[PDB]
């Protein structure tokens, strides 16, 4: 006898398990057991993943309900699971989304300067260099301090919350509440700090004192800062890191993008499509009985939308494991989700990766792994898949 199939299948971010394609072909929605012991429906085809994400009766907010089957333990207060809904109800969605576009004058040049300085320091120190800890993550942290309007010198401490905040744990995490409360206190202080006049926090600070927002809570304002810093930094740092592995693995593509940087946006779009950064399916709780493929999902059941299921589906992306810069449907992947909860930072995440890669290829055109790929250490029980270190030479 065997036990019910357990998710996640693998913490490795450098290869997709053969099991994904087998499930997609034979059982594109099928029952699995999560790390908490709960049962869930794992959805692994493009067509069914899109159906789930585009039907709001598969609810994000209700995943936080007491007694629900859980993918993993909450690491934030349950109301924060509905963060974007709370932002919209407060009348803040347009202002938040304007503050986090990569369009602020000087932002791209800031990103370019920061990337180049980080790379110069690695060259001075000599190979091997760690492109996660000493390039991709600092670049993500610096970008998000700039976008939020907060001091660069505060970035490192805020960053150090993230290896716990973004755990994917079977049980509640005591350190997560310690760090959450401290970071909330920090952002609350930022809102009262007269030096903070730019970026997302500068704008929130002004709206907070505007009569049209006098009954929006100070807790929500601080929460926006904590959640956008954390989600943005973890997502961009982790995506860039694993994208760099996929690029290093492909010397022909590396050289092409070095020789024609105008193709970097199309290359980043394919790197997004093939990215394994999300460690778990996206969770949703059914609020009605809904037919998904051959399965009638019942009200109250947990559904997990496997992004690499959709993004490697050959019915939608032929030759799915190959980076092709000339696909006719290049942005139709689900790397940023789909529907009501589509990533509000998508443009910023694209630009972070594009500029980081452009700078790396100019400074280190011969970049290559400094260890055999099987020597990378894949973080476990985390909401992203990332190597603990990414050692390179050039
Ligand atoms: C390449 C980088 C990024 C990737 C791959 C990514 C991926 C995603 C995905 C897949 C979702 C949907 C989650 C779901 O539907 O359950 C999402 C949502 C979200 N992302 Fe991103 N993201 C990235 C960058 C960013 C940045 C830069 C920010 C903020 C500065 C950000 C903030 C958020 C937030 C707040 C949500 C929740 C949206 C909602 O619930 O409506 N992300 N992201
Ligand atoms: C729906 O927009 C969201 C945005 C962010 C989060 C989230 N922020 N942080 C976090 C960030 C910084 C410090 C500490 C915690 C962790 C999560 C993800 N998480 C945990 C439990 N359930 C979801 C959530 C929603």
UniProtKB/Swiss-Prot annotation:
Key words of the record? Cytoplasm, Heme, Iron, Metal-binding, Monooxygenase, Oxidoreductase
Q: Does the keyword Lyase apply?
A: no
List the InterPro entries. Answer: Cyt_P450 (IPR001128), Cyt_P450_B (IPR002397), Cyt_P450_CS (IPR017972), Cyt_P450_sf (IPR036396)
Listed EC numbers: 1.14.19.70
Give the site residues for Important for the position of heme: 344
Instruction: Provide the reaction this enzyme catalyses.
Output: cyclo(L-tyrosyl-L-tyrosyl) + 2 reduced [2Fe-2S]-[ferredoxin] + O2 + 2 H(+) = mycoclysin + 2 oxidized [2Fe-2S]-[ferredoxin] + 2 H2O
Give the enzyme class.
oxidoreductase
UniProt key word Oxidoreductase: yes
Name the site position(s) for Participates in a stacking interactions with the tyrosyl of cYY.
166, 180
Return the Gene3D superfamilies for the record: Cytochrome P450 (1.10.630.10)
Q: What does this protein do?
A: Catalyzes C-C bond formation between the carbons ortho to the phenolic hydroxyl of cyclo(L-tyr-L-tyr) (cYY) producing mycocyclosin. Can also use cyclo(L-Tyr-L-Phe) (cYF), cyclo(L-Tyr-L-Trp) (cYW) and cyclo(L-Tyr-L-3,4-dihydroxyphenylalanine) (cY-DOPA) as substrate.
The protein here is known as: Mycocyclosin synthase
Native source organism of the sequence: Mycobacterium tuberculosis (strain CDC 1551 / Oshkosh)
């Amino acid at each position: 006898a065997t036990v019910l199939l357990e998710v996640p299948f693998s913490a490795r971010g450098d290869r997709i398990p053969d099991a994904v394609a087998e499930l997609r072909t034979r059982e594109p929605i099928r029952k699995v057991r999560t790390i908490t012991g709960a049962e869930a429906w794992l959805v692994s085809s493009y067509a069914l993943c899109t159906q789930v994400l585009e039907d709001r009766r598969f609810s994000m907010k209700e995943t936080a309900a007491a007694g629900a089957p859980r993918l993993n333990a909450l690491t934030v207060p349950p109301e924060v699971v509905n963060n974007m809904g709370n932002i919209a109800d407060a009348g803040l969605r347009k202002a938040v989304m304007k503050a986090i576009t990569p369009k602020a004058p000087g932002l791209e040049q800031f990103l370019r300067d920061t990337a180049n300085s980080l790379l110069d320091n690695l060259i001075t120190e000599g190979a091997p260099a760690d492109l996660r800890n000493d390039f991709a993550d600092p670049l993500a942290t610096a970008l998000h301090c700039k976008v939020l309007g907060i001091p660069q010198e505060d970035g490192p401490k805020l960053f150090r919350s993230l290896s716990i905040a973004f755990m994917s744990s079977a049980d509640p995490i005591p350190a997560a509440k310690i760090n959450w409360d401290r970071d909330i206190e920090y952002m609350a202080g930022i809102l009262e700090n007269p030096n903070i006049t730019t970026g997302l926090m500068g704008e929130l600070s002004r709206l907070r004192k505007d009569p049209a927002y006098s009954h929006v809570s100070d807790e929500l304002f601080a929460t926006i800062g904590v959640t956008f810093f954390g989600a943005g930094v973890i997502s961009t740092g982790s995506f860039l890191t694993t994208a760099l592995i996929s690029l290093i693995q492909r010397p022909q593509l590396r050289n092409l993008l070095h020789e024609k940087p105008e193709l970097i946006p199309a290359g980043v779009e394919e790197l997004l499509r093939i990215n394994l950064s999300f460690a778990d399916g996206l969770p949703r709780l059914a609020t009605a009985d809904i037919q998904v493929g051959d399965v009638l999902v019942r009200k109250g059941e947990l559904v997990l939308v496997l992004l690499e299921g959709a993004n490697f589906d050959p019915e939608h992306f032929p030759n799915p494991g190959s980076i092709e810069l000339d696909r006719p449907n290049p942005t139709s992947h689900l790397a940023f989700g789909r529907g009501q909860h589509f990533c509000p930072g998508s443009a910023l995440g694209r630009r972070h990766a594009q500029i980081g890669i452009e700078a790396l290829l100019k400074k280190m055109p011969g970049v290559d792994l400094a260890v055999p790929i099987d020597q990378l250490v894949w973080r476990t029980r985390f909401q992203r898949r990332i190597p603990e270190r990414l050692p390179v030479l050039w």
